[PDB]
Design a protein around this ligand. Sequence first.
Ligand SMILES: Cc1cc(CN2CCN(c3c(Br)cnc4nc(-c5ccc(N6CCN(C)CC6)cc5)[nH]c34)CC2)no1
Length: 249
Amino acid sequence: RQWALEDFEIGRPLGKGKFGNVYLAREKQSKFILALKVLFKAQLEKAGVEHQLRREVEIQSHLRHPNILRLYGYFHDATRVYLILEYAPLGTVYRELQKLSKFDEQRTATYITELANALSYCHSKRVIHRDIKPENLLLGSAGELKIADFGWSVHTLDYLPPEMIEHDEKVDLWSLGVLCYEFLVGKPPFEANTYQETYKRISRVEFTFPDFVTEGARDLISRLLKHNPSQRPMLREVLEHPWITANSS
Ligand SMILES: Cc1cc(CN2CCN(c3c(Br)cnc4nc(-c5ccc(N6CCN(C)CC6)cc5)[nH]c34)CC2)no1
């Protein structure tokens, strides 16, 4: 189905990005709610990424898990391009997170699992995201976890493993590692004040749990945060892992 801007009304702007921004919008015929990524041909050009968006659409489209954000369609005009996206009412995890400091274990566990399955499905198609971070995981109405923004979902550093900063489905695991940490602590294991400062920390795997990071939580994160990609688990062992198991939903 070939679209056109004139088909939707426009609610508030959910966010504003470098390349454009996202407005709440409703489809005029079915009165259907969704988010609507808006981006500028000019801006995409001047940074040369017409590809990540051939290859974000070619992808997100082809995909259908609960925990992944369904890209419904696409179209463009003279100057900008429109992505017709699913809409997650409860906002981003990032906001949830900084909104309330850190997450309890259950909450964390859950997300991770969902995340994991979400991931497990993706890699079932040997697809890897490589852009995972709280500000890319949204919350559906039921409060579910949806993963979005496929800038670099092929086949700032806080979340990227060594392999990348210097890769197969491994990459993600690592990030999942980082991600878990933040969730429980409030910051990424390597948060550094300086770009180059970080690279160092990440390159060398220099993180340290506060006392309250009880349990094989501490374990799990270590288990994940390996420099040797081939030595991280798989989602299976992960959802399986007790601490997840005991706490997840
Ligand atoms: C270009 C560009 C990228 C972005 C980043 N966005 C990606 C995700 N965005 C949303 C998408 Br796509 C789908 N559903 C969304 N729902 C929200 C949302 C919902 C509620 C709230 N509030 C704000 C006010 N309040 C205190 C309660 C919670 C915030 C966000 N965002 C969604 C948008 C951002 N931007 O341009």
